[PDB]
Every structure is written in C-alpha cells, then in structure tokens.
Write a protein that binds this ligand. Structure first.
Ligand SMILES: [Mg+2]
Ligand SMILES: [Mg+2]
Ligand SMILES: [Mg+2]
Ligand SMILES: [Mg+2]
Ligand SMILES: [Mg+2]
Ligand SMILES: [Mg+2]
Ligand SMILES: [Mg+2]
Ligand SMILES: [Mg+2]
Ligand SMILES: [Mg+2]
Ligand SMILES: [Mg+2]
Ligand SMILES: [Mg+2]
Ligand SMILES: [Mg+2]
Ligand SMILES: [Mg+2]
Ligand SMILES: [Mg+2]
Ligand SMILES: [Mg+2]
Ligand SMILES: [Mg+2]
Ligand SMILES: [Mg+2]
Ligand SMILES: [Mg+2]
Ligand SMILES: [Mg+2]
Ligand SMILES: [Mg+2]
Ligand SMILES: [Mg+2]
Ligand SMILES: [Mg+2]
Ligand SMILES: [Mg+2]
Ligand SMILES: [Mg+2]
Lengths: 135, 204, 155, 141
RNA sequence: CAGCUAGUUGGUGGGGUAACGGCCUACCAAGGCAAUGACGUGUAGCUAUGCUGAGAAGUAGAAUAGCCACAAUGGGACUG
RNA sequence: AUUGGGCGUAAAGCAAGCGCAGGCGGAUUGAAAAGUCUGGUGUUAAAGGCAGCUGCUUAACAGUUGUAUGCAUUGGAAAC
RNA sequence: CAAGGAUAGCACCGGUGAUUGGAGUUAAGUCGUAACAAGGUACCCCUACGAGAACGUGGGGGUGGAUCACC
RNA sequence: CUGCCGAUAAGGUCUUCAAAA
C-alpha cells in the first residue's frame, strides 16, 4: 500500500493449521491441562467399529473405527487393510493420513504393532502393513 | 557392496566398461534393454529428468560409487574459484581403485577393489586399506610384493597395454602417474557436463 | 543444423453438431546455437502435419540474437500478458540454471551461463514470449556508444 | 526566449523531470519546459556531460524572481531516442542513502546512477573513484 | 484488553543499605504513567547460535558456551 | 510482495463532506550539523560461519591462521 | 515485622449440563419449480409485511436486461 | 395480442504417441 500505512499497521501473516490436530494434545492427568506438543503418532483405544460409504465416485463398504486416544479426543480412524481383529474394545496405535473417500477421517491405524494383528497373505509393500518376511 | 549382474545394467544403457567384454559376450550378441519388455516402440524423447538420471547412473556405475559418496565429492569440488570443469574430472578419475585397474594390474575394476580391500597395495610411502582415497598426480603408488607371486599375476604383469596418463614403470613397479586424463581417455560412455547442474539442484 | 525440440503438445478441440473436432497443437523452438532462433505454433488433425507446419512457421520468423562472453549482458525483465520473466547475467561456469520453456529458448539461442526466474504464469506461450521480448530489448555496449558519443564502451 | 503557455511543475523535483523526459520520449516530443531549481539544474548538467540530452538551457525572467529551464532531447537521425528508461530511487517518504559498498551499478555500467553525496549530484563511476557515497536520486539508462 | 497508579509523584529532617535511592520513617503537598498502547489477558528463560533462504529474512532457542532464575511448597535468619 | 502484489468487469475505493494529531510539501540566501557520507581508536567473549593448512590409511572429525556485523567516542565533508 | 489459618464479598478464566437453535457432510427419499432464454410475472440491491417452502407483494435504486427501432 | 404450459434416478468411455521415414 504505502510506507506510512504499513508502519502503523504492519503486515500480519496468515496462520497455518495442522492436518492431524488430535495427535498434538497431551493431557498430564495430574493437573488436567492440555498442552500443544507435537508427536508423530499416538496410541488409542477403539469404541465402535462399523462401515461407511465413500463420497461420490467410489462405492464400497469401508471399516472405520471410533478410537479414543490417550488424550480426550475422539477421532474416527480407518483400518487400512483387508480384515481386522478389532472387537469394539481394543488398543490401536494411530498414525497420520487422510482417506479421501470417507469425510472426516484424517488418521490411520499402524498395522501389526500392539494388540492389532499384522496383515498376512501379503508379499508386496509389507514394510507398511506389517507382515513377517516369508523367508 | 555392488551389483552382481553387470551385464544387465551395461546392456541397457549400451556402454560397457570400454572393452565391450560385457556386451560382446559369447552369446546372442544382445543389444536390447533387458527383461521381457525390451523390444518395444517408444524409444526416444526421454524427458530431461529421464535422460539425466539414466546418464547420472552411467557415471556412478562406471566407477562403483554410492550416490551419497557422489554428493560428498560434488560438495567438495563445487566451491573453489570458478568454472572448475577441469578439476572434478580429475577428482572423479583420482579414485585409488580406478587407477589400479587403469594401472593394468587387475583384470576388472571391481576385482581391483577386492585386492585393494584385502591390503595388496601400497601408496607412496604408506599402505592402502580403503578403496576411496583421493590421489594426486605425483605419488609413487608402488605395487605390493607378496602379491607378485600369487597364481594371478599373469594378466596383472601384462601392463604393456596402459593408458598414457599413467607411467606405471613395470618391473620396478614404481607405480607413479601424472598428465591428468583428457576427455579422450574418458570415452563417450559418459561425456557430459549438465550432470553438474542436476546435482546443483539436488545438492546445494 | 537448426535443431528443434517440442516444448508443449496441447490437445485443443471445438464442438460441432454432434461430437468434438480434436486437433493437436505443438510449440516448437528452432535454433542454430549461434544466434538465430524462432518459434512456431501450429494446429492440425495429426501430430506429423502439425510438426511440419509449426517448424515452417518457426523458420519463417527467425530473430537475431547477440551473445556476450556466452551469457546475457545486463539484467532484463520480459513482459507478455501476466507472465514476467527475469533474466540475469551469470559468471562463466554456472551453466544453464533455467528450467522448462525458458531453458529451451536459452539453450537453442547459444547462451550458456544464465540466471532465470518466471515471476508470473506458467503458460508456455507467454513464457517464450516474455523471454524473447526481454532478449530483444537488450542493449549492446556499442549501440549506446553511437548514442553516447563515448569511446567504444571505454569507461 | 518567449513562450505562450503557463509553466507548472510538481512539488517533487526529481520525479517531475523524470515524467517530462519519459513522456517526451514516449510521445516523440523534443522541446519541453519547466520551472528551475538548483538540484534539477545540477542533475541536468551531469546528464548533458554524459550525453543523454543534447542541450539544456535554464532561463530567467526580467525581474529576477522566476527561472524556468527548457530542455530538448538528443534524438538520432532515425528518430529513436537515446534514453530508454527512467526510474527514481530516492522517492518521497523513503529517502535512499547508500554507502559505497552497496553503491549500485546500473546495467553493468551502461546506465548512469545519479548520486548527490557531498559535492552536488555526481555519477556512479566517479563516486566509485572517490570511494564516497550518499543520496541516490534516480536511475537513468 | 482504555484508564491505571495512594509509597504511586516531589520536597524537608532522620533512619537504614557495600552504595544512590519512598529502600524505610514523620511532616508538607497532588502528582506520575497512558492511544507513539499504559493496564490486563495469554505465552515464553534471554543471547552467541542450529536448520532453511540468492537475498531481505523465516523458524527452534538440540548439544555445547555466556547471563538470569530455581532446589518438595512458602517465609526468616546465623556464619562468612 | 521494504527489496517484491493488487482494488471498473476476478477478493478489495468507506455513501459523501468539514476536518485536529500524523505523513508529505513552492524558489533563493546564512548558520548550525539531527539525519546522510567519511578517517582514527575502543568494543562486539570463546566455539560455530567462509577461505587456506595440518593431523588422523583419505574422509566425517579435531586443531590451526585468516575472515565480518552492530554500538559508542572523536576528527572532517555540506549536495538532500 | 511476618509465612500460614479462619471468615467475607467482588474480578477473570475453564469443564460440564436436561432441553433447544442453526450449520456442514452425505449414489439413486417426499412437496413444489424460485434462478440461468423475454426461464415463461425481466432480473438484482436495500427495506416492511405475509405465506408449507423456494419465495409473493408494496416503496425506492441499477442495467450487471431481451424485443424494438431509425439512411 | 396476450388461456394454460410442471417435472426428467447414480457412476461412467474415447485418443493411443512422434521417436521418423
Ligand atoms: Mg442438432
Ligand atoms: Mg525525597
Ligand atoms: Mg526465496
Ligand atoms: Mg542449548
Ligand atoms: Mg535444553
Ligand atoms: Mg494478486
Ligand atoms: Mg468485486
Ligand atoms: Mg465512491
Ligand atoms: Mg462500495
Ligand atoms: Mg478539504
Ligand atoms: Mg495537519
Ligand atoms: Mg524544495
Ligand atoms: Mg565471536
Ligand atoms: Mg572443528
Ligand atoms: Mg417434484
Ligand atoms: Mg422459473
Ligand atoms: Mg406461470
Ligand atoms: Mg421470473
Ligand atoms: Mg398449511
Ligand atoms: Mg400477498
Ligand atoms: Mg417490488
Ligand atoms: Mg422496484
Ligand atoms: Mg442513484
Ligand atoms: Mg389451459
């Protein structure tokens, strides 16, 4: 605009928001305060398994899950794989992501880590799904 | 740490290790890209990225280098004075294992690496244990001794076929070298200068 | 040896009473790598005929380019529509640091060392247009001598 | 020398002249007039020594209260000017003060930069020679 | 987040502090700061520097190094 | 988007005016020297940054010498 | 002199809450057909009232309106 | 010369390519 105008009211930068907000909240429990500390991936416990329908082009039945994380945020997380051992009550170790078919899902469950089983009958891209090398 | 199928990568690009031993072979005289999908159309018009990466592999497969080593050497040579297009060619050709094969004391380049790794070589006044030392023209890289009697010295002692940039001085095995290699001794297998700009994008 | 390199192959189409008339358009840059370069854009039902006509048009319009020590003498901004391309002198050794349409024009002209930046749009026609306007407005240090009544550029 | 028209000028003395030269170049006009100030006279004197304009004459009234400079541009035989583009540095508001180390070189010395350090307006080359810098009025190339 | 500040502003004599000082005291006054952002809220140890950027600068204040602050929480003092 | 963007039809000219503080501002002369420019001195801890070299089989790394930035003071320049 | 304790009323901030308001997102739900052509009553802006709903009408304002036309 | 005149389930192809003769 003009030098005089910018000296009075400087240039305020637009902000930046994350894509996986629920993974950066830590509850201390001893004081019951939530701080914003970034963490790559977080552990949670599922509450409700089921199916959802993709947006428009896609047509299928995708398995979602309502997992409550160590914090106090409830997020619907897609189970990336063919077949699950979730039994409404289980523990899962969520990661980042964003499935485009289901609106609202922005997290993925890391497969084959804790209570959740690996994805057997897979020889391609195993390192991501978690299957022991056939050897 | 290297590939065990040098024929496959040499046959695709088209250029061998400069004697065509891996291209002539004893069978089928194959000059097609390997795999079932070798005899197809859509041959030319590789994008600049495509041809640069294929060519970049050619340079770093001719000498047995890992790309990370390449980034290190490029970062070293890049900053100095100016258009250093005469230095990095000498630097890339200054590898100790490269000079020993060009010394004429090994049947193949990577076989020379094994002899280097096994300690059968001495530098000017010290020994060699790592096949990555950067040499400078003037060092009497005298050959070892306990290796002149091994059942493989025959082709090794036939160094009469040698490039002019190395004054091997056989028998006495003085093993010196000078007169840095011109582009003539670096044949058209890899002769280009826009790989520097490719690494300029990838390496600061 | 006027080499030629396709810089873009778009797929334009009009609509008729049922169906879509589809014709390919090519943007070829022809250059002798000594100071002569032209551009030609042509449309045809098939790629071969389009390429022939585009090269013919490009060869019909060849401009003259001056090089100083292999690089560009002075910084210049080429403007064409909403595309603005910045050209900068470079020391002998950097190489062509250009990319895309700008890189093709500079290589085909003869220039070696060159700093470039597309400050505007990413439409190939405007990038080539901007590069050529910037290169054509360049002033030699002898034309200004006739103008300034100096001593052949001498301080 | 007589005129018939009123002579006006802008309050900013560098860009006033800059508009006159650029408009005259753009409109193919040759002779223009404006009111005279010592800075504008000085920038025009170094300008005519470097050869961008042909003549530059400042005039005064018969009462000694007003002075107006009427300058003409140096066109070649084919009627294309010698000036190509003008751009001002020490804009109003933001005064440009540069030491010697950041003294600009316009088009690798092809153009001239006007710098009034301590002895009136002064060219970039002689500023480098004296190794002293200061106010930079405008870029002319 | 538009008023805030009553030892807050100043003088006097005295006391106290390694030292100057409303640091403290008795008296005399009503000032001081504030739209060029006081005050309030939220946040945070600061810096040399680390990563990034052609540059202007953006970003974190790893390690280590300077300064400050703290030693379960909140106060007081001895020795020196 | 200071360097480095825009506001007719794409986001963006307040419905218009009187207007204090702020920003900008005709020509000439004199002085001062606050900006501006320059010389000398002090300082800007060390490590890190960049250059050269040495030492580890070369490197990574370590050491080594060089390498600015700003502030204050003093002496001049007088074009804005 | 004074940490702390008890009593007392203001100030700021957070969580939760029966019930309720709208909002977004959703392959193939129901009632109309308001807008894009003169969209079949030209459209749009402000405003007041009214109606299942899009919206209708009154007042002012615009062409970012079609047709029309002139030798 | 101005009656009346409302609606139309979802997702979808089709350009393979100029290296050249
Ligand atoms: Mg029809
Ligand atoms: Mg007092
Ligand atoms: Mg940048
Ligand atoms: Mg630290
Ligand atoms: Mg720490
Ligand atoms: Mg914009
Ligand atoms: Mg608008
Ligand atoms: Mg208006
Ligand atoms: Mg308006
Ligand atoms: Mg007025
Ligand atoms: Mg005023
Ligand atoms: Mg004035
Ligand atoms: Mg230091
Ligand atoms: Mg070190
Ligand atoms: Mg219906
Ligand atoms: Mg309708
Ligand atoms: Mg109707
Ligand atoms: Mg209607
Ligand atoms: Mg009803
Ligand atoms: Mg009604
Ligand atoms: Mg109405
Ligand atoms: Mg109306
Ligand atoms: Mg009106
Ligand atoms: Mg009817």
């Amino acid at each position: 605009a003009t030098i005089a105008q910018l000296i009075r009211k400087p240039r305020k930068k637009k902000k930046v928001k994350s894509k996986s907000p629920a993974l950066h909240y830590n509850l201390n429990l001893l004081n019951k305060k939530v701080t914003n500390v970034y963490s790559p991936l977080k552990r949670g416990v599922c509450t409700r398994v089921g199916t959802m329908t993709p947006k428009k082009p896609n047509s299928a039945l995708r398995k979602y899950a309502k997992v409550r994380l160590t914090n106090g945020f409830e997020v619907l997380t897609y189970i990336p794989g063919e077949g699950h051992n979730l039994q409404e009550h289980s523990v899962t170790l969520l990661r980042g992501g964003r499935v485009k078919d289901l609106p609202g899902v922005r997290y993925h469950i890391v497969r084959g880590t804790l209570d959740t089983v690996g994805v057997e009958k897979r020889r391609q891209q195993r390192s991501a799904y978690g299957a022991k090398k056939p050897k | 740490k290297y590939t065990g199928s040098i024929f496959k990568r040499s046959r695709r690009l088209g250029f061998s290790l400069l004697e065509n031993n891996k291209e002539f072979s004893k069978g089928k005289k194959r000059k097609t890209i390997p795999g079932q999908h070798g005899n197809r159309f859509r041959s030319s018009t590789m994008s600049g990225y495509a041809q640069q990466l294929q060519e970049k592999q050619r340079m770093q497969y001719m000498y047995g280098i890992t790309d990370k080593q390449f980034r290190r050497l490029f970062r070293l040579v890049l900053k100095q004075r100016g258009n250093l297009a005469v230095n990095l060619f000498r630097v890339l050709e200054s590898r100790l294992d490269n000079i020993v094969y060009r010394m004429g004391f090994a049947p193949t380049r990577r076989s020379a690496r094994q002899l280097v790794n096994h300690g059968h070589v001495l530098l000017n006044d010290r020994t060699v244990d790592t096949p990555s030392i950067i040499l400078n023209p003037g060092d009497k890289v005298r050959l070892k001794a306990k290796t002149i009697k091994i059942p493989i010295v025959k082709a090794a002692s036939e160094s009469g076929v040698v490039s002019p940039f190395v004054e091997t001085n056989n028998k006495t095995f003085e093993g010196t070298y000078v007169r840095f290699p011109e582009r003539s001794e670096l044949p058209a297998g890899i002769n280009e200068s826009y790989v520097v700009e490719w690494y300029k994008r990838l390496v600061k | 040896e006027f080499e030629e390199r396709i810089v873009k192959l778009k797929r334009i189409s009009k609509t008729t009473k049922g169906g879509r008339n589809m014709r390919f358009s090519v943007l070829v840059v022809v250059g002798n790598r000594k100071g002569k370069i032209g551009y030609g854009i042509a449309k045809a039902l098939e790629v071969p005929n389009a390429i022939k006509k585009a090269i013919k048009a490009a060869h019909n319009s060849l401009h003259t380019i001056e090089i100083h020590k292999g690089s560009i003498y002075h910084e210049v901004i080429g403007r064409s529509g909403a595309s603005r391309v910045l050209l900068k002198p470079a020391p002998q050794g950097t190489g062509i640091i250009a990319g895309g349409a700008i890189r093709a024009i500079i290589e085909l002209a003869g220039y070696s060392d060159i700093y470039t930046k597309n400050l505007g749009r990413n439409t190939p026609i405007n990038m080539i247009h901007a590069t050529m306007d910037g290169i054509l407005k360049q002033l030699s240090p002898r034309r200004v001598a006739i103008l300034r009544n100096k001593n052949l550029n001498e301080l | 020398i007589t005129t018939t028209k009123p002579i006006k000028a802008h309050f900013d003395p560098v860009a006033d002249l800059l508009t006159k030269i650029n408009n005259a170049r753009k409109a193919k006009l040759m002779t223009v007039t404006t009111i005279a100030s010592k800075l504008k006279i000085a920038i025009l004197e170094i300008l005519v020594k470097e050869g961008y304009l042909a003549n530059f004459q400042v005039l005064e009234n018969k009462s000694k209260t007003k002075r107006i400079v009427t300058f003409n541009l140096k066109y070649t035989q084919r009627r294309i000017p010698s000036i190509n583009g003008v751009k001002q540095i020490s804009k109003p508001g933001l005064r440009i003060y540069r030491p010697f180390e950041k003294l600009p070189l316009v088009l690798n010395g092809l153009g001239i930069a006007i710098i009034s350090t301590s002895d009136g307006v002064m060219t970039d080359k002689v500023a480098r020679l004296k190794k002293i810098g200061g106010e930079i009025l405008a870029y002319v190339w």
